[PDB]
Amino acid sequence: GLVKMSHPSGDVEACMVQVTCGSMTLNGLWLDNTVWCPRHVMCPLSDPNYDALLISMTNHSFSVQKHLRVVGHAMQGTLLKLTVDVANPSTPAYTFTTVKPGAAFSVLACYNGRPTGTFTVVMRPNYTIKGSFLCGSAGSVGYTKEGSVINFCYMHQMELANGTHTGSAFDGTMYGAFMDKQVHQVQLTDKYCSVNVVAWLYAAILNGCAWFVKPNRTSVVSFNEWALANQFTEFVGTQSVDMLAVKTGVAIEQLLYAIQQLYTGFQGKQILGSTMLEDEFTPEDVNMQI
Amino acid sequence: LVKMSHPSGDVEACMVQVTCGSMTLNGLWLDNTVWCPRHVMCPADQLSDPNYDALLISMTNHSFSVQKHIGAPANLRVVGHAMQGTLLKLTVDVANPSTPAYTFTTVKPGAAFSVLACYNGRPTGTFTVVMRPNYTIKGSFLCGSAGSVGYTKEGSVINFCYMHQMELANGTHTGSAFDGTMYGAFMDKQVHQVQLTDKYCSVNVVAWLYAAILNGCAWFVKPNRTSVVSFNEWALANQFTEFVGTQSVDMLAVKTGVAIEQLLYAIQQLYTGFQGKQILGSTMLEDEFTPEDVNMQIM
Ligand SMILES: Cn1cnc(Cn2c(=O)nc(Nc3cc4cn(C)nc4cc3Cl)n(Cc3cc(F)c(F)cc3F)c2=O)n1
Ligand SMILES: Cn1cnc(Cn2c(=O)nc(Nc3cc4cn(C)nc4cc3Cl)n(Cc3cc(F)c(F)cc3F)c2=O)n1
């Protein structure tokens, strides 16, 4: 069976700081001479004018604590870019790439600048995540690692009226275009991550559970038109999926056909003990864990 | 309801690679001591029947090489060696300057801890497991993970509770407590060993049903009740642990208004299968969430 696995968090722990502006406080991320944090900390809340708020900021509007003097301030989308006079001596090698729905990443949950827990989520097709966050977590950070390069991909912003969560990429854009204000907002309807359901079926086949494999095939292009009408994402193949097809001898298109049948029901059978489709493990997860 | 682990940085700073002859695995560097599994002493002949007492006598301080790869790299010299149960206690001539405040305590079945999986002294992943009623854990471990460390954290104090030793069957593992005793009394040698049958951790199943009620999923709740004593007689016959209430569980009962005995009755109906229904996105009973975990996460 598959195990939820997160990256070691030490590297990122060393970058977490607390940012306070007026009576607001949250978490920031300190890289080199810059502290990133959500611009909501500038707000005195239901409909802020962040452009005016930025103008009103003065030399000592922000205070940064590591559990740091601010020399400049800028805004990049829904994030603030705060210049500090001391460079983080433990800045990892990093990139800022936006994650796509179905991709997994690790989250370091923090409160007032202190790391408290870590877990892994997949970005949902409706650009929310199913995290575990309490009040005081605004500015917590999500990331993947490739080699020793950290890709920072998520800065936490808000809990929606569901239990679901959203935030920003470090280019400043909010995932799913949610507005960083306290107004009722409703997410789009979620979908199954097709490529992840495919990975899970491959995991089943690797563990001896393969009754759903038939010779029938459904092409990618044909599955994708069906998916638009049945709350699945578009399937996009990857070399990681190809590796699963090679070591099982079962082609993607056989599994696309199987999903079409399984969406109707499992007949009277189980898959890896479950009678529901699973889309929270990626092809990369299955490759490295089986 | 996410699988939550402690931030791993405190423990990452203590992981080292330990080598002896042709064997290499992970060690834990705390002050002037490096802890690692004693299997690192075992030669290729005798991997199935080692004489660790004799192996230890044949060893010198010079038999052991120790490196720290991540963070500030490694100048460690072994100046002493001892064996404690299934663990080696190596003494080095530099005290780890990032040693956390720590304790050694053995965990009991049903309790959860974080694991930092490492390979050749390099941390690669973290996850949370529960100590199973048959004294195994179901982690994600590959070859080269022997000596990876499990732990909890309370305030500033890390409790180290697990040093990974062996894969018993696919996906089933065991290890030592830091007093050196193997969980489940498994033997640290290359031989097939059968484990006792696993059981559902009843108090964690109860915590999870409370989490479902808190989240608006309560179709399984009936007025009907089963007493603790009568449930525990049933559990003996159905591979469930004995239910033992705690203050953490009582908090959930007060908040939801649903008595423990109502959920004990519901478990008896739900192990007969969910019919076609789901609970918190699952079609089977879940027992890896503790009452403390549910109280923490759902407040
Ligand atoms: C339950 N929950 C789960 N995730 C979250 C995230 N979250 C948060 O941690 N804080 C928020 N509001 C603040 C209140 C403050 C009080 N002080 C003294 N300082 C504060 C700082 C913040 Cl950020 N919010 C709400 C929220 C945050 C935003 F970034 C935003 F644009 C709009 C919002 F309505 C929040 O969701 N809470
Ligand atoms: C798939 N898997 C999941 N968990 C494990 C744990 N595990 C392990 O990582 N290594 C082991 N044997 C070694 C071989 C070595 C080869 N070199 C060069 N160095 C080695 C070091 C070790 Cl420890 N084992 C097997 C094993 C380990 C013990 F500690 C023991 F007492 C008996 C055993 F059969 C292992 O289970 N692998």
Instruction: Taking the CA atoms of B101, B103, B104 and B107 in sequence, report the sign of the dihedral they define.
Output: negative
DSSP class of residue A15? T
How far apart CA B147 and CA B159 sit, in angstroms, is 16
* CB contact (8 A) between residue A130 and residue B8: no
Q: What is the distance between the alpha carbons of residues B152 and B175, in angstroms, rounded to a whole number?
A: 16
Distance B143 CA to ligand 2 centre (A): 6
β-pairing, A114-122 vs A141-146, is: unpaired
Write the CA distances from B30 to A238, A279, B16, B74, B116, integer angstroms.
43, 40, 10, 14, 16
Judge whether B36 and B26 are in contact, CB under 8 Å. yes
| Cα separation values, A34 from A79, A115, A152, B257, Å | 12, 19, 14, 49
Distance (Å, rounded) from C-alpha B130 to C-alpha B111? 5
Nearest alpha carbon to residue B50 among B163, B174, B146, B187? B187
Q: Which residues contact A101 (CB under 8 A, 6 or more apart)?
A: A122, A123, A124, A125, A127, A193, A233
State the Cα–Cα distance between residues A144 and B193, nearest whole angstrom: 38
Solved with: X-ray
Residue A256 to residue A276: CA distance in whole angstroms: 16
Exposed/middle/buried for B272, CB within 10 Å: 0-12, 13-18, 19+? exposed
Q: H or E element: which one contains B208?
A: helix B202-214
Greatest C-alpha distance within chain B: 69
Give which of A173, A176, A174, A169 is closest to A190, Cα–Cα. A176
Residue B275 makes CB contacts below 8 A (sequence gap 6+) with: none
Place of tokens 């449930």: B231
- Going by C-alpha positions, the residue among B123, B105, B104 that lies closest to residue B33 is B104
A221: phi then psi, degrees, rounded to nearest 5: -60, -40
Task: Give, for B275, the enclosing helix (H) or strand (E).
Answer: none
User: Residue B24, Cα to own-chain centre: how many angstroms?
Assistant: 22
Residues 6+ apart with CB under 8 A from B66: B16, B17, B18, B19, B27, B29, B34, B74, B76, B78, B90, B92
Q: Is A172 left (phi over 0), alpha (psi -120 to 50) or beta?
A: left
Query: Which residue in B86, B51, B66 sits closest to B188, CA to CA?
Result: B86
B172 exposure class (CB count in 10 Å sphere: 0-12, 13-18, 19+): middle
In B, minimum Cα distance to A8 occurs at B125
From A33's Cα to the closest Cα of chain B, the distance in A is 21
CB A140 within 8 A of CB A105: no
Cα separation, A263 vs A244, in Å, equals 22
> What CA–CA distances, in Å, run from A152 to A102, A107, A144, A169, B226?
16, 10, 7, 8, 50
Pair of tokens at residue A255: 């599994």
Q: How far apart are CA B266 and CA B240, in angstroms?
A: 14
Task: Tell me how far CA of residue A56 lies from CA of A53, A68, A141, in angstroms.
Answer: 5, 21, 27
Please choose, from the candidates B7, B188, B248, the residue with its C-alpha nearest in 3D space to the C-alpha of residue A12.
B7
**What's the gap in Å between the CA of A201 and the closest CA on chain B?**
17
Contacts of A68 (CB under 8 A, 6+ apart): A17, A30, A35, A84, A85, A86
Strand partners, B200: B240
Reading the block at residue A105, the tokens are 């990443």
Q: Please write down the long-range contacts of B219-223, taking CB distance under 8 Å and 24 or more positions apart.
A: B219/B277, B220/B266, B220/B269, B220/B270, B220/B277, B220/B279, B221/B258, B221/B262, B221/B263, B221/B266, B222/B262, B222/B265, B222/B266, B222/B269, B223/B262
Can you tell me the distance from the alpha carbon of B20 to that of B168, in angstroms, rounded to the nearest whole number? 23
In angstroms and rounded to an integer, the radius of gyration of the C-alpha atoms of chain B is 22
Whole-angstrom distance, CA of residue A22 vs CA of residue A61: 7
Helix axes B202-214, B260-270, angle to 10 degrees: 100
Name residues whose C-beta falls within 8 Å of residue A135's C-beta, 6 or more positions apart in sequence. Answer: none
- Separation of alpha carbons A187 and A195, rounded Å: 22
Ligand 2 within 6 A of B23 CB?
yes
Q: How many residues does chain A have?
A: 290
- How many angstroms separate the CA atoms of A62 and A79, rounded? 14
Contact of B195 with B136, CB cutoff 8 Å? yes
- In sequence order, what are the residues at sequence separation of 6 or more whose Cβ sits closer than 8 angstroms to the Cβ of residue B192? none
Breaks (C-N over 2.5 A) in chain A follow: 44, 67
Residue from the list B1, B6, B124 with its beta carbon closest to the beta carbon of A117: B6
Instruction: Please give the structure tokens belonging to residue B217.
Output: 């999923």
What is the β-pairing status of strands B101-104 and B157-169? parallel
**B83, burial (CB in 10 Å: exposed 0-12, middle 13-18, buried 19+):** middle
CA-CA distances (angstroms) from residue B90 to B34, B65, B68, B71, B72? Answer: 5, 10, 14, 21, 20
Q: Does B122 touch chain A (CB under 8 A)?
A: no
Q: Using a CB-CB distance cutoff of 8 angstroms, which residues of chain A are in contact with residue B13? A: 10
Residue B34: which of B81, B86, B2 has the closest Cα?
B81
Distance CA A213, CA A252 (A): 11
Q: Give CA angle at A177 (A174, A180), nearest 5°.
A: 65
CA-based R_g, chain A, Å: 21
**Is A66's Cβ below 8 Å from some Cβ in B?**
no
* CA B63 from centre of chain: 30
The token pair at B151 is 């732990």
Three-state DSSP at B173 gives strand
Of A6, A121, A274, the CB nearest to B126: A6
The number of C-alpha atoms within 13 Å of B213 and in the hemisphere containing its C-beta is: 22
Across the beta sheet with A79-84, the strand order is: A62-65, A16-21, A24-31, A34-38, A79-84, A70-76
**SS3 sequence, A116-164?**
EEEEEEECCCCCCECCCCCCCCCCCEEEEEECCEEEEEEEEEEECCCCC
The ligand 1 atom at the shortest distance from the C-alpha of residue A78 is: 31
Instruction: State the nearest Cα–Cα gap between B290 and chain A, in angstroms.
Output: 15
Sequence-separated (6 or more) residues with CB below 8 Å from residue A154: A99, A105, A107, A129, A141, A142, A143, A167, A168, A169, A175
Task: Report the run of H or E that residue A186 belongs to, with start and end.
Answer: none
Ligand 2 within 6 A of B24 CB? Answer: yes
Nearest to A8 among B8, B139, B297 (CB): B8
Distance CA A243, CA A264 (A): 28
Look at ligand 2, atom 25, and give the residue with the nearest C-alpha.
B166
Q: Which residues of B touch A8 (CB under 8 A)?
A: 8-9, 12, 116, 123-126
- Do the Cβ atoms of B225 and B260 come closer than 8 Å? no
Q: How far is the CA of B110 from the centre of ligand 1 (A)?
A: 34
Please report how the helices A252-264 and A194-206 are oriented relative to each other, as an axis angle in degrees rounded to 10. 100
Mapped onto helix, strand or coil, the DSSP state of residue A283 is helix
Q: How far apart are CA A18 and CA A139, in angstroms?
A: 9
B277 contacts chain A (CB < 8 A):
no
Q: Give, in degrees to the nearest 5, the angle at Cα B78 between B74 and B79.
A: 140
Name, in order, each residue with C-beta under 8 angstroms of B154's C-beta and a sequence gap of 6 or more. Answer: none
- In degrees rounded to 5, what are phi and psi of residue B64? -115, 130
- Looking at the complex, report in whole angstroms how far the Cα of residue B61 sits from the nearest Cα belonging to chain A: 31
Closest by alpha carbon to A117, among A94, A133, A139? A133
> What's the resolution in A?
2.0
